[PDB]
Every structure is written in structure tokens, then in C-alpha cells.
Design an enzyme around this catalytic site. Structure first.
Site, PDB file in Angstrom:
ATOM      1  N   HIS A  57       0.757  -0.936   0.283  1.00 39.24           N
ATOM      2  CA  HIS A  57      -0.108   0.076   0.058  1.00 39.24           C
ATOM      3  C   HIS A  57       0.825   1.137  -0.143  1.00 39.24           C
ATOM      4  O   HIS A  57       1.189   2.170   1.197  1.00 39.24           O
ATOM      5  CB  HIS A  57      -1.570  -0.348   1.255  1.00 39.24           C
ATOM      6  CG  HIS A  57      -2.045   1.492   1.111  1.00 39.24           C
ATOM      7  ND1 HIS A  57      -2.660   1.915   0.351  1.00 39.24           N
ATOM      8  CD2 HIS A  57      -1.485   2.335   1.779  1.00 39.24           C
ATOM      9  CE1 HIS A  57      -3.709   2.513   0.879  1.00 39.24           C
ATOM     10  NE2 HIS A  57      -2.805   3.176   1.210  1.00 39.24           N
ATOM     11  N   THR A  92      -6.749  11.125   3.033  1.00 37.71           N
ATOM     12  CA  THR A  92      -7.797  10.483   2.901  1.00 37.71           C
ATOM     13  C   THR A  92      -9.221  10.148   3.859  1.00 37.71           C
ATOM     14  O   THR A  92      -7.698   9.687   5.060  1.00 37.71           O
ATOM     15  CB  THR A  92      -7.045   9.627   1.740  1.00 37.71           C
ATOM     16  OG1 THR A  92      -7.137   8.509   2.712  1.00 37.71           O
ATOM     17  CG2 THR A  92      -6.568   9.869   1.264  1.00 37.71           C
TER      18      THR A  92
HETATM   19  N1  NAD Z   1      -4.276   2.009   4.891  1.00 39.63           N
HETATM   20  C1  NAD Z   1      -4.774   3.424   4.292  1.00 39.63           C
HETATM   21  O1  NAD Z   1      -5.191   2.427   3.327  1.00 39.63           O
HETATM   22  C2  NAD Z   1      -4.376   4.182   5.199  1.00 39.63           C
HETATM   23  C3  NAD Z   1      -5.599   5.461   4.219  1.00 39.63           C
HETATM   24  C4  NAD Z   1      -5.881   6.710   4.835  1.00 39.63           C
HETATM   25  C5  NAD Z   1      -4.999   6.780   6.012  1.00 39.63           C
HETATM   26  N2  NAD Z   1      -4.391   5.194   6.707  1.00 39.63           N
HETATM   27  C6  NAD Z   1      -3.689   5.856   8.112  1.00 39.63           C
HETATM   28  O2  NAD Z   1      -4.579   6.529   9.241  1.00 39.63           O
HETATM   29  C7  NAD Z   1      -4.411   7.031   9.597  1.00 39.63           C
HETATM   30  C8  NAD Z   1      -4.767   8.226  10.833  1.00 39.63           C
HETATM   31  O3  NAD Z   1      -4.898   9.160   9.403  1.00 39.63           O
HETATM   32  P1  NAD Z   1      -6.054  10.424  10.254  1.00 39.63           P
HETATM   33  O4  NAD Z   1      -5.985  11.172   8.631  1.00 39.63           O
HETATM   34  O5  NAD Z   1      -7.004   9.858  10.482  1.00 39.63           O
HETATM   35  O6  NAD Z   1      -4.593  11.063  10.995  1.00 39.63           O
HETATM   36  P2  NAD Z   1      -4.320  12.015  12.198  1.00 39.63           P
HETATM   37  O7  NAD Z   1      -2.254  11.794  12.251  1.00 39.63           O
HETATM   38  O8  NAD Z   1      -5.517  13.269  11.915  1.00 39.63           O
HETATM   39  O9  NAD Z   1      -4.898  11.024  13.294  1.00 39.63           O
HETATM   40  C9  NAD Z   1      -4.410  10.615  14.461  1.00 39.63           C
HETATM   41  C10 NAD Z   1      -5.160   9.939  15.767  1.00 39.63           C
HETATM   42  O10 NAD Z   1      -4.622   8.696  16.267  1.00 39.63           O
HETATM   43  C11 NAD Z   1      -4.310   9.554  17.540  1.00 39.63           C
HETATM   44  N3  NAD Z   1      -3.355   8.897  18.019  1.00 39.63           N
HETATM   45  C12 NAD Z   1      -2.097   9.024  17.810  1.00 39.63           C
HETATM   46  N4  NAD Z   1      -1.170   7.545  18.758  1.00 39.63           N
HETATM   47  C13 NAD Z   1      -2.641   7.206  19.359  1.00 39.63           C
HETATM   48  C14 NAD Z   1      -2.692   5.938  20.783  1.00 39.63           C
HETATM   49  N5  NAD Z   1      -1.189   5.636  20.630  1.00 39.63           N
HETATM   50  N6  NAD Z   1      -3.640   5.755  20.872  1.00 39.63           N
HETATM   51  C15 NAD Z   1      -4.569   6.110  20.336  1.00 39.63           C
HETATM   52  N7  NAD Z   1      -4.728   6.338  19.152  1.00 39.63           N
HETATM   53  C16 NAD Z   1      -3.446   7.548  18.929  1.00 39.63           C
HETATM   54  C17 NAD Z   1      -4.412  11.045  17.189  1.00 39.63           C
HETATM   55  O11 NAD Z   1      -4.610  11.433  18.679  1.00 39.63           O
HETATM   56  C18 NAD Z   1      -5.203  11.035  16.385  1.00 39.63           C
HETATM   57  O12 NAD Z   1      -6.753  11.961  17.158  1.00 39.63           O
HETATM   58  C19 NAD Z   1      -2.876   7.508   9.758  1.00 39.63           C
HETATM   59  O13 NAD Z   1      -1.217   6.520   9.471  1.00 39.63           O
HETATM   60  C20 NAD Z   1      -2.982   7.298   7.778  1.00 39.63           C
HETATM   61  O14 NAD Z   1      -1.778   7.771   7.186  1.00 39.63           O
HETATM   62  C21 NAD Z   1      -4.365   4.605   5.753  1.00 39.63           C
END
Ligand code: NAD
Ligand code: NAD
Ligand code: NAD
Ligand code: NAD
Lengths: 322, 322, 322, 322
Positions: free
Chosen positions: D180, D234
């Protein structure tokens, strides 16, 4: 004839993108168009959505950035453009009247060049203010304009009592009416739980501490500000309300719902938008149901009327007449 | 733990096959099992359904002919086995008591060998009779037995008023209670339309001819017999009621609904099943809500109690006590 | 413009009532009209459905008995009128050509007086015969006529392989083409399972007994007759196929699907209806995709063409030309 | 037994809140719990959702802020915690390995104290890295861990070809496999459109400019970065992929899908997570399907293996063995 259903969402930020995505989840359109001054955001939102609608369980719903020419053949246009109140600011949506009245004039200005037939669902705050501006400043079929209004407060009312008594929120009948704002009130005269008075739940559940009507009405108002302060904004509950009105329109349901429109003499009030019970169908608002309010409820409707009309006046929106 | 949801439908004729297919349409199970004395019919119904669940928009729901061993890990068991009243016969479901009491004993006899944990939804007529037999003749958790009861009359009530006034049936609040049969009655004390009295609709719609409560209550009863005479049987509305209870159970909704179970002293009545308001959740019926009936409504509940208890007696089903 | 979607179902027996009820379950219409020579049945079916659509989870879908004037503003008209093959009869739908060709002429005769704009979904057997009659004997936009055809055999293909290997039927790609009947065939050249050859599943699952293509093709044909013999009729899988085409039309999906229409030179065949891959959208069939068949598959398409054309000839339906 | 379905979402920001809201829209849970270091955000998201689930068309889905004790009886736990790549930053999710590996260890550290039975759906980036960390650093049933992986790239593949040729994306079969990330690739050997080669669409549509495989593979990768740059992040397409896996688990579908898990010798690769075709059911990943890749596709799988394993090494995650 046309088998397709086209919905345009103006404003592609937190609210518009939640409305658009609920529409896609419930498969309420063939085509969803996003319009924003920030076309990059509208394009990104539409692209992210276009991937979701490639799932095996999704219909092939066409998402795209568009412009006002997409209003020509729009069944529904949901207006979400303009700023909200922000964390730590004065908890008063009416402070948005001056700025958002101007945005609504600009946006409705462009819509009416392309269509006189789209159902307009207003969401932009101050909701009653915005609903008033688009209803009075342009020649547009009045039936085709609805503000979501106190539908969202009504969901909040249901959830509070659902959570308090561990009952289905769908069992909670009746309405929160007036302003989508600090002059929202519970029309207790209209309420029940599963065919009995809400005040009887304390007896059924042997509660020593009795329900406070004032506590419920303040909670359902205050919770909007707590969510804005803690989440940064709100979008989920309003997206759901938007979809509920969309379904009343597309299924020609004839549902009586709390929604915002310019009053025409109900409760002695005219030339202001507030939420009162109104029937929603394929042709939009067919009419109001002027339910018999207690003296206290009538006073609250008048206070709401006065507060919205004063916000319209403060934003330089004229009184209108027939 | 178990991510799967298994529903067994006993009786694979018009009612069972409609219940099974609504379950499949709403994706309320992983696995739907059909049981019938006529295994050929059960197999054919399951095969036809297995083709529908190969559609791109269906989850892969496993349909098959089965036997009582499928009750071991059943979340829900819907009982539809036994004959109905037929076109041109006496319009009285209670005439089925003698034959269908015996079928219910045989069917519940087999279920309880395999499970004490499945939610049982009774549909077989006489509904209150059948619900009574399975509730009293076997040791089974009482909370896990629900008859659909006057949920279906309540849909009929909503549709009649919806059709009369061109209003959404979902706006019609309150219940039809008592017997799923000739002693069904409207609990007008529990009713409303969109937060106002049902009797006020004539004023809102300027009708000269006033609503007849007796006309509405007779129509909602008589329409079941007209459908049986004209269609041959009924299945759609009951399949829908079945799915509504399934959703209250699987979403642990805590919904207060009219449904049939053995009364335990409500309205001075015990040792008979009738529909009164009851909360439905993941553990089945949590409790009743003994709404305050008018003297006339209380009389109708007693008449219903007397009529079902006399049908149980006529079918050689004993009185039971604690 | 019109926010409402109106679907008319002609024939309110087992098939029509299943199509109508799937439409209601998936909320694919505002209004569902039933037409039958037996108006009592149509009325009973519509009444039973009207109770289901009073559920809190249903949109207020208007069900009613109607007549051909309901075709004037119909988005879609599903034709299910006419008898089926009955248990113990010759397993050959083409035996229905003589009787059902006449019914289709009568029914299409009435439709074309009221509309030239409704999407027509043919289901009545012999499916290819019926689809041919309505396509050639009347001036009607050709794009607005689709027979469900071998969509249902294709669901059957998916289920057989799904059940054999315990795989999702949605992973089974490709088509059953030709006649909805004994000259249906699997276009193996078009097939796969989850991006690999269907013949490789035996290796992945270490099966000693190898898949028989002939066994799969005979099973998917024979199972229709087994269901008719054991259930009495079929309706669930066809109702599902009907809804799948309805969704391709209402969501303007541009889905390539097996469906029946008059061929215009594909595979050297004209002036007969068979199922070949066709794109379905808001304007009905946009075009065919003449996939490259093996010599054996082409022979089967020709055999299907010959068998349907001979049934049309036997029923006194003329050859037609441009 | 337990009729309830409980899903815990860890991380209540853009991705977690979109996953939670899609779950609520599709009614895939009884109870949705949000966990975040920022409990205010988790509470606000849950409150906003609790209002949406008070709609007449919603089941009473219980949303709330929770903590790791909510993992004890969780059916599914979706992990979205940790930062994303931000607009204008290096378009390489693998840069998140060092920070997000530590978050995943902390989060999985807490989960395994409460449960060994929850299906874990990994979303946190780098997706293959995160999926590897939770699969290898803790004793947890390996079948109960799935990364969404190249399911989302596969939706993107479908949409690009759907948009290019005006065909239903559901007609686009086959997979994007590998990382990914920048080492995602189209397994063209696995692909088709509606039962024919994707390269034949140019002929069917008489296009002069021929499809570029490299152009399609770069677009489906690059579009993720364009959406991040233009929308800021996203969430919609990933929320949809999350729900697709949830449905394969809850409907025990046996669907073969691209998803991320530690390879065990497929393509000569072990001790790294990548997306390869895997069957998903109520017990999670039952097995892989090692489809026969061309020499070029195999090279791309090896490049993906090398790139993820190097990111794991750079973040101080050990090699593991049996
Ligand atoms: N796999 C995919 O296709 C895909 C697509 C989109 C995003 N993502 C991933 O999803 C994740 C989240 O994206 P986002 O835009 O919501 O990010 P973001 O940075 O806006 O939010 C992340 C959240 O995680 C929380 N967090 C951090 N450490 C934590 C912990 N130890 N315990 C609990 N909560 C914790 C933060 O407080 C925050 O609210 C990212 O890693 C992003 O790259 C994956
Ligand atoms: N009625 C309700 O119950 C309810 C609930 C939530 C929010 N709201 C209101 O919805 C509105 C949107 O909320 P948000 O959080 O998405 O706000 P936001 O400030 O995050 O986004 C507003 C968007 O409107 C766009 N915009 C501004 N002027 C525009 C114009 N002339 N034409 C097109 N687009 C324009 C901006 O570029 C921006 O993308 C606010 O007014 C908010 O108060 C109403
Ligand atoms: N509660 C309601 O609102 C409601 C509505 C409609 C029908 N009903 C009742 O539902 C029942 C079924 O209606 P129908 O139209 O399907 O009836 P039907 O006579 O067409 O079919 C009954 C089926 O039960 C099977 N059966 C009989 N004894 C059995 C046994 N011991 N074990 C297993 N299967 C057995 C028969 O073989 C047959 O297939 C009737 O009692 C009817 O009155 C209730
Ligand atoms: N294409 C498929 O895959 C598929 C599958 C199942 C059934 N079918 C066909 O669907 C048709 C209906 O099946 P069924 O089981 O409901 O049949 P049925 O015999 O039970 O009912 C046919 C109905 O058509 C009505 N009818 C007859 N002539 C009519 C006319 N001129 N106008 C209006 N209504 C008229 C009859 O009164 C009756 O109600 C049959 O031809 C059957 O073979 C097709």
C-alpha cells in the site's frame, strides 16, 4: 423522462463532505457534484468518494468537482458553504449572520440563473437566517426551500432521553422547535415515549431523581457547542438530517418534520424563518401544521422569532411583505 | 467468539419463505436455514434464495434445507409452521387453536432438545395461542419468546390513517393491542400523528366527514381477511414485522413495541398471551410497559384475554401458575 | 422535474409479487403499481405490501392496484404476466411460446398507448420469445427493452461454484449466455474466480475429482426444473435479477451484464433475442459487447439462436428485418 | 450466546471517524467505541454519531468514548491511530515507519491484555509495516489480523478504468497487489473487464490512443498523494475498504480479496507483510491464493517485499522466524 438523480453539494468541507458521503452510503443519488471556492478540496473530496463508490456493494455513483452549470439538472442542492463558529468562540451561531448572509446571496444568485426546479436544502449557519435570505431575496418556488433546522436538535432530544432511560430514540416522539440555536425549545405538548408521557418514564424505571425539562432542553442546545469545542466542528448528525429530508422528498413521503422556512402567520409570526412542523414531499414543503402550543411554548416561539429577526436586521437583511 | 448470525425458519411455505427472503434482503443473517415436514419445499425455497444471494449487491448468505440440529447454534428461530385460515372459511384465527397447538408442542419439543439460548419469534396462528403454548409447556427462558402479535395490526393502523390523510405512516404513533385477531383494539389513549391528536387531522385537512374510531379499528381487523380472500394468504406485512423484531434483538435497540407474550398481572390479567407494549433487546423481552388504558380500552383488553384463554381451553391447553 | 420513481409490475402472482417486494425492500421506487387480469390478487398483494411499507425502517412506498393509465408516468415496467411450466410438465419453457406470445402482444399493445419512455424489463417465459415479441411487433425505443435472460443462470453458475469450493459467489466472473432455457451455456472463455482460472480451484483445494464443465452447465440448467418441481415455481432469484437491472438503470451504472434483446448481427445472428453481454444504463441497453467465443461456444450460441427462432416460428411470430 | 456486535475504532480523527460512520450507515455493529489519546475528540465524534443514530431510518447504534476494556468483548478492532503524511511532505508512507511502529506496539500491547478473539483490521500507515508489527511482536491468532492493503488501490484501479471507458467499476476484475505505497503494482495477469481483456476496451470503444498500463499503475498510486495535497488527508475510500472486510468477516463470505498479512513463502517471500489474494471469513484470513504472476509481476512483488522489509529494518523492527 430521466431515471437519474443528481444532487449538488455547495461547500465541500466537513459538513458538505459528510452530507455527500451519507448520500453515497444510502445510494440517494446517481451523481453527486461538489462545488467550493476551494476547487482543490471539492476535487479531492469527490476523488476520495469516487474510490468508495467502486466497492462491490456500492452503486456506480458518479462523484466530481463541478460548477453552477451542474445546478441546471440538479434534483436537490444542499447548501453548506460558509464558516462555522469555532472552538472557544461565543456560542452563538447568529454571530455568523453578517458574513454568511452575503455568501448565501452570492450562492443563491448563481443557482437561480440555472434552475427554478431543484429542491434546496439549507444547512449553512445561522440556519434560519440563511433559509430566510434565499427564500426572500430571490424569486424561487417557496415550496422548494427547506432548512434542516431543529431536525438535528430533535435527534439530540431523542438521544438524551434514549441514553437516560435505555430506550430506543425512535420511541421518543415530538419536536424541538424554533431556532437552530439558543432559542431552540422542546415542545413538550407534542412529545411522548412509545405512546405514554415522557414524565412517566421515572415511574416505570423507579427513578428517585425526577427528569428536569429545563435540563433536557439546555443539554440538547449545549451539546452542539461541546462537540464543536471537543471535535472542532460537527457534521455527522447534520449529514443524517440532510439525508432524512432527501428521503422525504425522493420517496414523496408526506412526512411531518421540524424544518426551517419563512413563517406565514403561524403563532402570529411572519417574515422570519424558524422550525415548525411541516409536511415534506416530492414537491418540497406542502404546508405547516400549527400544533397548539402551551402559553410557555408560544412565548419561546416568539422569543425565537425576535432573536432571528434581530440577527437578520443586524446583518442588513430587510423585512419583506406580500 | 462467533461473528456469524444463524436464523432458522420453521415452515417454508408462504410466510416462512417471505420472512427468510426479507431477512436475506436486509442482510440480517450469515446463514438462513429452512425446516419443513415438506423438505422438498424447504430445499426449493432455500435453492431459489441461494441464487438471489449470489447477486453482486448481496452478502454471501448461506441458505439451505436443514433439520433441528441447526437450532443448536441458532441466534433466532422464527416459527411459521402450520395451516392458516383459507379463503371463504370462518374469519377466526382461533379456529386453528386445536391443530396448531399440537404442531407448536411438536416443534418446540424438538427445539428445546438443542437450545435454551435462541430468540424464538412466534408467527404461527392463533398467534397468542401459539405464543402461550411454547411459553408454558416447556422450560425455556421466558425473555427469549416473542409473538409478532399486534405489530402487524399496528402497521395496518398506520397505513389506513396514512392513506386517509396522505401523511407518512411513520408519523402515526401508538398501538393496536390485545389479540392478533377479532379482539385486536386501537389504544387511542396511546396515539398521535406527528405530535398532535389523530382527531385533529380532520381540522388540519378541512374534512366535513369526521374520522370514525370504530371504522378504523374494524378496517385494520377486516383487511387481513380481505387479503386472505383476494390474495389467498398474507405474508409480506408479517415478514416485515418479523424483521422489525429481529432488528430490535440484533441491534439491542431497547425498542418498546406491541408484541405477544404471557401476561404476568398487567391490567389484572395473567396466564394468557396478548400484545401489550414491551421492550425488545438482545436478550429478548426485558419487560412490559403497562400504559394507563381508558375504561373502554381496559374492557377490550379483558375481552381479548377472555377470548384467547377460551380458545386455549377449547384446544385442551391447561391453565398454568407460579 | 420529477423526484418520484414509479414502477409498474404486470402480473401480481408469485414472480410479480416477489419483484414488487424486492423493489420495496431495496427502496427502488416511490410508487409500485400492480396490474393483473385478477385485480383481486393485485389488490391483495398491494395491500399486504402497503402494511410492510408502514414499518419504521421503510420509506413510505405507495403500493396499489392499478391499470394501464399507471404506465403513462412509469419509469420502469416489469412484465411477469402469463403462466409458467408446472411441476411434472415437460421441462421446456419454449412450450409456453404460443400462449405467452399472445399475452405479451396484448400487454405491450396497452403499454404503447400510454408511454414510449418507460424502461421495460421482460421476465415472462419463454423469456427470449417474450423479449422478441415486444421488441419487433411494436414501435418502441429498442434501448428501453431488456429481458433478464441468463442473468439468473449466471447467479446459478456463481452459487454452484461458490458452494462447491466454499468461495464468495461474487468472486465468480463471466457469463452464462444464450437462451434462458435448455440452450443456456457457460461462456468459459469469459470466466474466472478472483483473478485466476476456475479450473485452478481443484489445485488450490487439492481436489482429486476434477471439475466437470458439462456437470456445472447441466446443474445450472436443471436446478430451475428441480425448484419448480419441489417449490412449485421460482420467484426469489428472478426478483433479485430484476432488481439488479433496475439498479443499473436508476444508478446509470453502465454495467456490462448478460441480458436478452434482439441480436443485430453479433456472432452472425439477427432477428432473434438471446442473452449476450450488454451495457445497461439510465437509457436502457446502450450496446452489446461481442466477446470472442471459442468455436464450441459459438456453436452453442447458434444452437440457442436456432431453438428460440424455431419456438417463435411455432407460435406464429414472423421473421422481421430492416 | 451474544446477539450484539461490538466494534472498537482506535484513533478517532479523519480515518477513524469515517470508518465508524460508514459502520453506522451500513448498520454493521450494535455498539461502536472510539479510543483516542485525545479523549475529547473521541467523545465529540461519538456524540455527533449518537445523534445520527437517532434518525428514524437508523438502528439504535450505541456510540461512545471508551478505553481498552471495550476490547474485551469486541468482535472487530479497527486500528487507525497515528499520523499520516501531510500535504507537501515526501510522498512516501514508509517515512512513518519509525513513529507509527512504536504507536502500533503500544496499541497492540493494550489490546492483547483484553482479548485474543477480536478480528483486527489494520489501517494505520505504513500499512504493511503496521500489519507486520502487530502480527510478529505479540502472540495473537495470525488469522485475526488483516491490513486493508491494496484493496484501496484496487478500488482506484476500478475507478480509473470505469471513468476512462464509462463502464461500471464492478466490471473491473483483478488486483493491485504488493505495498500500500509506491511499490503497489497492477497484476494485469489477474485482470479483466466484464469477461474480456482490459486491453480490448480500446477496440470496443474505437479509441485511437491505446491504454498505457504504466499510466494506469502510476495514476492509482499518485492519486492518493493528490487527494492528500488537495483535501489534506484521505478517509472515504479507506472507510469503504474497512467496511468491505467487515462484511466478509460478519457474513462469513469466503471472499478472495487483496489484503496485507505476513507472507509465509508465497512468491519466495517470508517475514514481510504485503497484499496478496487472501480468503476472508468469520475467522479472518483462512489462507492465501498464490496466483501465477508473470516474471515482471513477480519482480514487482520482490521489489515491494524489499522496500517494506527495509522500512521495517529502518524503524528498528526485527526479522522474525519459525
Ligand atoms: N491504509 C490506508 O489505505 C490508509 C488511508 C488513509 C489513512 N491511513 C492512515 O491512517 C492513519 C490515521 O489517519 P488520520 O488522517 O486519521 O490521522 P491523524 O493524524 O489526523 O489522526 C491520528 C489519530 O491517532 C491518535 N493517536 C495517536 N497515537 C495514539 C495512540 N497511541 N493511541 C490512540 N490514539 C492515538 C491521534 O490522537 C489522532 O487523533 C494514518 O497513519 C494514515 O496514514 C491509511
Ligand atoms: N444546520 C446545522 O445543523 C449545521 C450543522 C453543522 C454545521 N452547519 C453549518 O454548515 C456550514 C459549513 O460548516 P463546515 O464545518 O463545513 O465549515 P467550514 O468553514 O469548514 O467550510 C465552509 C466551506 O464553504 C466554502 N465556501 C465559502 N464561501 C463559499 C462560496 N461563496 N461558494 C462556495 N463555497 C464557499 C469554503 O471554501 C469552505 O470549504 C457552517 O455555516 C456551519 O455552521 C450547520
Ligand atoms: N402472526 C401473523 O401476523 C401471521 C400472518 C400470516 C400468517 N400467519 C400464520 O403463519 C402460519 C403459516 O402460514 P402459511 O400461509 O405459510 O401456511 P401454509 O399452510 O401455506 O404452510 C404451513 C407450512 O407449515 C409446514 N408444517 C406443518 N406442520 C409442521 C411441522 N410440525 N414442522 C414443520 N413444518 C410444518 C407445512 O408443511 C407447510 O409448509 C399460519 O399459521 C398462519 O395463520 C401469521
Ligand atoms: N425469466 C425468468 O428467469 C423467470 C423466472 C421465473 C418465472 N418466469 C416467468 O414469469 C411468468 C410468471 O410466473 P408466475 O409463477 O408468477 O406465473 P403464474 O401463472 O402463477 O401467474 C401469472 C399471472 O399473470 C396474470 N396474467 C395472465 N395474463 C395476463 C394479462 N394479459 N394481463 C395481466 N396479467 C395477466 C395471471 O392472472 C397471473 O396472476 C411465467 O411466464 C414464468 O415462466 C420467468
Amino acid at each position: 423522462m430521466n431515471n437519474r438523480r443528481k444532487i449538488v453539494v455547495i461547500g465541500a468541507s466537513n459538513v458538505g463532505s459528510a452530507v455527500a458521503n451519507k448520500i453515497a452510503d444510502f445510494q440517494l443519488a446517481t451523481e453527486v457534484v461538489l462545488i467550493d471556492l476551494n476547487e482543490d478540496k471539492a476535487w479531492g473530496e469527490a476523488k476520495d468518494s469516487s474510490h468508495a463508490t467502486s466497492c462491490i456493494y456500492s452503486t456506480n455513483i458518479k462523484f466530481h468537482l463541478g460548477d453552477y452549470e451542474d445546478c441546471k439538472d440538479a434534483n436537490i442542492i444542499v447548501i453548506t458553504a460558509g464558516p462555522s463558529i469555532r472552538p472557544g468562540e461565543t456560542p452563538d451561531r447568529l454571530k455568523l449572520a453578517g458574513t454568511n448572509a452575503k455568501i448565501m446571496s452570492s450562492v443563491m444568485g448563481e443557482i437561480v440563473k440555472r434552475t427554478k426546479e431543484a429542491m434546496i436544502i439549507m444547512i449553512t449557519n445561522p440556519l434560519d437566517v440563511a433559509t430566510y435570505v434565499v427564500s426572500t431575496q430571490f424569486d424561487y418556488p417557496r415550496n422548494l426551500i427547506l432548512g434542516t433546522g431543529t431536525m438535528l436538535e430533535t435527534y439530540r432530544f431523542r438521544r438524551i432521553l434514549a441514553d437516560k432511560y435505555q430506550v430506543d430514540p425512535k420511541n421518543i416522539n415530538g419536536y424541538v422547535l424554533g431556532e437552530h440555536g439558543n432559542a431552540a425549545f422542546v415542545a413538550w405538548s407534542t412529545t411522548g415515549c412509545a405512546g405514554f408521557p415522557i414524565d412517566d418514564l421515572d415511574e416505570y424505571f423507579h427513578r428517585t431523581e425526577k427528569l428536569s425539562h429545563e435540563a433536557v432542553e439546555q443539554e440538547l442546545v449545549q451539546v452542539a457547542y461541546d462537540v464543536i469545542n471537543k471535535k472542532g466542528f460537527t457534521n455527522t448528525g447534520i449529514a443524517m438530517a440532510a439525508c432524512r429530508f432527501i428521503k422525504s422528498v425522493l420517496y414523496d413521503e408526506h412526512t411531518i418534520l421540524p424544518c426551517s422556512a419563512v413563517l406565514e402567520g403561524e403563532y402570529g409570526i411572519k417574515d422570519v424563518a424558524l422550525s415548525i412542523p411541516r409536511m415534506v414531499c416530492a414537491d418540497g414543503i406542502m404546508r405547516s401544521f400549527e400544533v397548539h402550543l402551551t402559553d410557555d411554548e408560544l412565548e419561546k416561539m416568539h422569543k425565537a422569532a425576535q432573536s432571528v429577526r434581530s440577527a437578520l436586521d443586524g446583518a442588513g437583511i430587510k423585512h419583506h411583505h406580500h
